[PDB]
């Protein structure tokens with residue numbers, strides 16, 4: 617249940633735009649190709665079988681899909697932990713990216729991370 621899921625990771629998970637998924641917290645601004653400070657996790661509140669894949673993509677109005685590294689993970693006990701997701705493509709200092717999350721249930725579900733993320737060559 618959502619209460620149970622929150623109680624397993626208190627103070628760590630945020631809403632996505634889907635009622636069915638939560639996520640861990642990403643930086644608001646990060647350096648291109650730098651390892652993330654908190655490994656990204658997508659958390660299913662609904663029934664999602666172990667092994668169900670989850671893929672993320674980043675983009676905005678001038679870059680439909682910015683390069684990522686290690687942008688797929690598999691669900692285990694309702695959590696898909698990305699071991700080393702990296703944001704390679706840069707948004708620049710003036711724009712940010714939306715991160716879309718696709719969970720490959722049958723059929724797939726799309727969610728969006730709750731904040732934009734800026735990616736630059738130097739980072740913050």
Ligand SMILES: [Br-]
Pocket residue numbers: 681682683704705706
């Ligand atoms: Br790119």
Ligand SMILES: [Br-]
Pocket residue numbers: 706707708709735736737738
């Ligand atoms: Br840049």
